[PDB]
């Protein structure tokens, strides 16, 4: 991890499209409307 | 309560320190929400509180922002703004007012307080080093 | 002192007294809390009359003076909690103890006046206590303070006085 | 409650309020560059390097001090303008 | 016709786990249920469950009491490195990067420098 960065030197909601759609349609994601 | 009243109340302890108070030239409070009515209610509350504390306040409305996106199915996010600019308030007044209005900040509303403190030049810069 | 306090806490009054005699025999001293334990034990000891027990309490206090230990609120509160067991004969000892506390600079708590009120309620003294306490704010000092107002209100119930 | 944007500090001072002569002012302006706005005569030093905000405030004050001192200093090399 | 505070007196005086348990027993004597919402907020503030207002985004964080010069000037940790070779150049680049890092503490920066020291010492 850090070792890898060193040797290199030497050289939005995190849900699925489906599960997002269900919550966004049910009004459970705050702020998300439909256009 | 018609008869049963608290005979006396314990006022909180506010001590007058010896250190000098901080001075704010301006104090801009930008509140963001998804609802214009909630921002209007909060503006009314904040302005009335500022009047009742003697603070000088001005209110304006920055332009709204709209983030649209697609998964067709089109989704939207609205962000509405209200800006409350306070002028010429000391450190203690600013702290008490901010505590009040931040504790009474409604759900779904975020705040950004920009404080412009007034400071004197450091002693070490007044005259060149010889 | 730890052993004596444990013994008295679990009703080992005679054994506590024996261990205190041993403490004296070893030329050791006792603490204020130890002496509170002893006062409780001496009163809870069976088959003795009021005068003998009061004399033992006075002897214990003279020992406290001898060992250079100064009392606290708990000592005199324990003495009054004990005196509550002896009804009419204990009233003037209780007033003496109250006068001693006010004299030696230890401010009485609510538990003290609670104990006095109950030892007397078995009653114009509540008026004096109220005249003292009017306008004061209290802080937690004795576990029995929360029993005061209850007892106090009981008196206003029995005496049938609304102003009190 | 953490927010990474709260560490930023912005110091604003008018150069006319500092004790600078002609050469000192010229050197300070050339050193700072775009931080100095000619229209407003304001020098704006924004510090966000350090994690905390008190550290960035101290750094801004230190930057201003060193800029003033190196504006009042004439290197040997300066003579070749 | 006199108060109970004037009269005869005794004249006898003039002027661990036990302690913890007695203190918690004294705590109980004023241990009442909450009376309203403000009291609940006060109790949560005292217990540390509720945030402290006005909001300070750097609350409970001090960065080990470090000062700016311990973040911005990291070139005293390059003393054991070569002073004028390309290794000096590379480590100057590394420290210039690290001194612009607001997300690391001083300890992590110096640990990076010490790892670099070890690696270049081996090679």
UniProtKB/Swiss-Prot annotation, chain A:
Intracellular or extracellular location(s): Mitochondrion
Superkingdom of this protein's organism: Eukaryota
Family that this chain belongs to: Belongs to the universal ribosomal protein uS14 family.
Disease: Combined oxidative phosphorylation deficiency 38: An autosomal recessive disorder due to mitochondrial dysfunction and characterized by perinatal hypertrophic cardiomyopathy, growth retardation, muscle hypotonia, elevated lactate, dysmorphy and intellectual disability.
Subunit structure: Component of the mitochondrial small ribosomal subunit (mt-SSU). Mature mammalian 55S mitochondrial ribosomes consist of a small (28S) and a large (39S) subunit. The 28S small subunit contains a 12S ribosomal RNA (12S mt-rRNA) and 30 different proteins. The 39S large subunit contains a 16S rRNA (16S mt-rRNA), a copy of mitochondrial valine transfer RNA (mt-tRNA(Val)), which plays an integral structural role, and 52 different proteins. Interacts with LIAT1.
Protein name, per record: Small ribosomal subunit protein uS14m
Organism: Homo sapiens
Curated annotation (Swiss-Prot), chain B:
Name the UniProt record assigns to this protein: Small ribosomal subunit protein uS10m
Single Gene Ontology BP annotation: mitochondrial translation
Gene designation: MRPS10
Family named by the database record: Belongs to the universal ribosomal protein uS10 family.
Complete-protein stretch covered: 50 to 189 of 201
Superkingdom as given in the UniProt entry: Eukaryota
Quaternary structure annotation from Swiss-Prot or TrEMBL: Component of the mitochondrial small ribosomal subunit (mt-SSU). Mature mammalian 55S mitochondrial ribosomes consist of a small (28S) and a large (39S) subunit. The 28S small subunit contains a 12S ribosomal RNA (12S mt-rRNA) and 30 different proteins. The 39S large subunit contains a 16S rRNA (16S mt-rRNA), a copy of mitochondrial valine transfer RNA (mt-tRNA(Val)), which plays an integral structural role, and 52 different proteins.
Signal sequence range: none
Keyword Ribosomal protein found: yes
Keywords, sorted A to Z: Mitochondrion, Ribonucleoprotein, Ribosomal protein
Curated annotation (Swiss-Prot), chain C:
Tissue distribution of the protein: Abundant in testes, skeletal muscle and heart tissue.
Repeat positions for PPR: 1-30, 31-71, 72-108, 109-142
Subcellular localization: Mitochondrion
Family: Belongs to the mitochondrion-specific ribosomal protein mS39 family.
Self-association state and partner proteins as the record states: Component of the mitochondrial small ribosomal subunit (mt-SSU). Mature mammalian 55S mitochondrial ribosomes consist of a small (28S) and a large (39S) subunit. The 28S small subunit contains a 12S ribosomal RNA (12S mt-rRNA) and 30 different proteins. The 39S large subunit contains a 16S rRNA (16S mt-rRNA), a copy of mitochondrial valine transfer RNA (mt-tRNA(Val)), which plays an integral structural role, and 52 different proteins. Associated with the 12S mitochondrial rRNA (12S mt-rRNA).
Linked pathology: Combined oxidative phosphorylation deficiency 51: An autosomal recessive, mitochondrial disorder characterized by intrauterine growth retardation, low birth weight, poor overall growth, progressive limb rigidity, delayed psychomotor development, hearing loss, and optic atrophy. Brain imaging shows abnormal bilateral signs at the basal ganglia and brainstem. Patient cells show decreased mitochondrial complex I and IV levels and activities, and generalized mitochondrial translation defects.
Function description: Mitochondrial RNA-binding protein that has a role in mitochondrial translation.
UniProtKB/Swiss-Prot annotation, chain E:
GO molecular function list: protein domain specific binding; RNA binding; structural constituent of ribosome
Subcellular location per the Swiss-Prot or TrEMBL entry: Mitochondrion
Keywords: Mitochondrion, Ribonucleoprotein, Ribosomal protein, Transit peptide
The keyword Protein transport appears for this protein: no
Any one GO cellular component localisation term in the record: mitochondrial inner membrane
Keyword Ribosomal protein: yes
Biological processes annotated in GO: mitochondrial translation
Coiled coil: none
Complex formation: Component of the mitochondrial small ribosomal subunit (mt-SSU). Mature mammalian 55S mitochondrial ribosomes consist of a small (28S) and a large (39S) subunit. The 28S small subunit contains a 12S ribosomal RNA (12S mt-rRNA) and 30 different proteins. The 39S large subunit contains a 16S rRNA (16S mt-rRNA), a copy of mitochondrial valine transfer RNA (mt-tRNA(Val)), which plays an integral structural role, and 52 different proteins.
Membership in a protein family: Belongs to the mitochondrion-specific ribosomal protein mS31 family.
Protein name, as recorded: Small ribosomal subunit protein mS31
Range of the intact protein held here: 247 to 383 of 395
